[PDB]
Symmetry: C4
Subunit: 228 residues, 4 copies
Amino acid sequence: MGRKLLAEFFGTFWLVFGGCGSAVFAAAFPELGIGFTGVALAFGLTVLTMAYAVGGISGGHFNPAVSVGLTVAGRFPASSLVPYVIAQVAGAIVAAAALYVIATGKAGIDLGGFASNGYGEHSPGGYSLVSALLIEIILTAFFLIVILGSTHGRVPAGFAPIAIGLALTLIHLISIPVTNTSVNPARSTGQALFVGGWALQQLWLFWLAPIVGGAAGAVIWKLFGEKD
Amino acid sequence: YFQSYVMGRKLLAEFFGTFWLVFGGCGSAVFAAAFPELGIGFTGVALAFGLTVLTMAYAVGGISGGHFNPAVSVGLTVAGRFPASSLVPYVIAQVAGAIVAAAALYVIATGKAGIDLGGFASNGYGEHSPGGYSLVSALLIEIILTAFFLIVILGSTHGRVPAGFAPIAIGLALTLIHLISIPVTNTSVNPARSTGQALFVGGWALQQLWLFWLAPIVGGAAGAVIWKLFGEK
Amino acid sequence: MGRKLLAEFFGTFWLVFGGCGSAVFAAAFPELGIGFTGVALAFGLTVLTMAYAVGGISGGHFNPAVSVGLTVAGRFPASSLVPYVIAQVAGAIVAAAALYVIATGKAGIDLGGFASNGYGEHSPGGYSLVSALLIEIILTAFFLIVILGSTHGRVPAGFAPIAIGLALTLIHLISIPVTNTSVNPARSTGQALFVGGWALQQLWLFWLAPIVGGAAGAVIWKLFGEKD
Amino acid sequence: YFQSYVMGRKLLAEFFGTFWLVFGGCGSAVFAAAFPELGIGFTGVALAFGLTVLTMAYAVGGISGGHFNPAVSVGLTVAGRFPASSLVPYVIAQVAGAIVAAAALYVIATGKAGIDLGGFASNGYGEHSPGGYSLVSALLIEIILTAFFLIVILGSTHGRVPAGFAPIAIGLALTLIHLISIPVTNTSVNPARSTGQALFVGGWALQQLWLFWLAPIVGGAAGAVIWKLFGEK
């Protein structure tokens, strides 16, 4: 069990340090930077890679809304939920801090939103709170449908990391302009704690919406996918 | 053919999958393709469409067959992989999934007011081809691209290839198809995908829609006929 | 055997119509075009996808220099070499022609080099004939090392298309500026026949260099990789 | 540990693989990254480096273990996956492969005369960090990135994951590492890769080279130590 919490901790750290750190260091670099596509690929590849490295140890959730959805689907014991959520939020916070220390090694850098998720005025594209809510619920619900589908016994072992990592990239290709893309309450919490201000005031949305999307995808999955 | 899952489950699978294909491929185009400085361009859209299929073919492919595409259902029927008796119900689940995804995209887009959605990721030709290509060019490239899409689907799901790899060959073939043809038609190869967007644009998009039923369905049947000639036995 | 020639024909057609057609229609499209990266990804994905669809029928060479390298490696009967080369060059020519018909459906388009490979003045980056020669030999030799390695019995079945497709993308990411990237005599012949002029005068280089690279990679492979 | 292939074959495998990693990752950077209008950028370089490893790990991974990287050989020794007695010979084959690839890139580049190769894809820090990041930033990010590279290599090659998927997790993890850190150090995580380029630039690149031996090797050992704590049993 301690092995499983460490798997979640290192995994969520990798997710945030790789995804957010590609956003902070590289996305807007002049002439050669990696754009929304490269951040999207980054975040999907943190999940693909640690899903292969530690998924067979903890299940490789790396994401509170995943742990909730897999509990609602009856794949995962509700008794492990809270500990997993604590291990995950701790990895995110420790990654946010390592990124912070490294980022400021560049003289007079402006961290800005520091890859925090936001809506309205803090939506990259100026989309409303209601747009933010709907798209985070829809995308997280589908994220769980892919995770529950691709880890079902009808799918041969070993392919789920590819499915689930690249589904995370696809989710970023769709929604970065709307919310910078959360679908993961832990991945939103670390960056926001370093920004404070508006980032903390909007943080609730990125706990509430992914958790409702993850639970909804679980319920939908149960209705047509999980039975033999 | 035998039944492996009851029809309601296969139809929901097809409904949710085609919803994902349009919501993710058309959503990436509407929200992110042209975003100033950092937007994802034709490349990021092609990746997104391929990934909706790769990820839903893994998620529900084992339930319905994972068509998400009337042209694919038709091609597999012509190749003798799928029963004609399931054709019409699948096509209806797929077109319903695409219309509901278009509507969902629209609702989310209204949260950024005063914005012009332009063609709303609709397919088109002539003045409505991103590069000004003619109706004949559109017709040809949709026939050839959908035919090869069918040949990749049929060969990668054949028993001579190990289970589990199809979603990756099929989803990446769709990304490849958009890399080639977005400048020509915005890329259909999928009558349901063309239909939901066009119903919201109306006008020229409804008027040109016929072509993105006819060409993909012709190409899908042609791919299937070609495959049965050399690949299936 | 007729099944195998048709596999090669459809395969090389897909390679050229997908790769070259991504170059002609999309690579330089204003604001949104796919650049050298998207052409590189295109060409690798034609091979990955048709290697899965028909590789188990003909071996999925799609490329005269592959057929030569696999013959030199003793993987493939020298008696099938010529027929495979004819089927491959025929797919390329028929794809070049379909691309031609479709491309000119755009009023007053300038086809330009029409994705032909070239060197010196016709190298995108102005690299010399000698640069062109060396990089086509090196990259084709490695292409065969990957193909022979990834289809060896020590590698589990089904992964070779991923290896070999993405190796082709990697080769394009390295060399498009130097020669537009051939590593495939058939893929160079179709486009050049439609351009004539300098494209025909340089065509020999793109037969000679990939065939020497493919044969060399086969010989190197035999020395350290092919034995149990 | 038992012998599966004789040492000459393992060394040639490592030599050719590290040659490919530098020739393809550094070649893509030198020839294509900054090409006017169509160049491939930090994204295309990160993809290229990841793909040299994915494709050579499939091609010769089954012969030598597919390290291509002194930091990887060290990490696997510390994790008890590889014998210390093979360490020095591997590291020498890898550094030789990288120097010969640098030389090969150089020869090909001379065919476009009067050109400035700049840093020639060398790694660096401070003034020689593409984004001006300090020595401490460089050191930290190379330790953390190489440690995770080791954790992904160790977990994906563990017996609890099916054979054949490692080249894909390991090569894509390298692409991810470049997506994160090219702005900081140009991305090393690999002392042999840093060494060949720097020997051609001389000057500051030879002077800063120490850091791209020390940090990757420290991070590789740390990743291995962490892995043995929770992952291996």
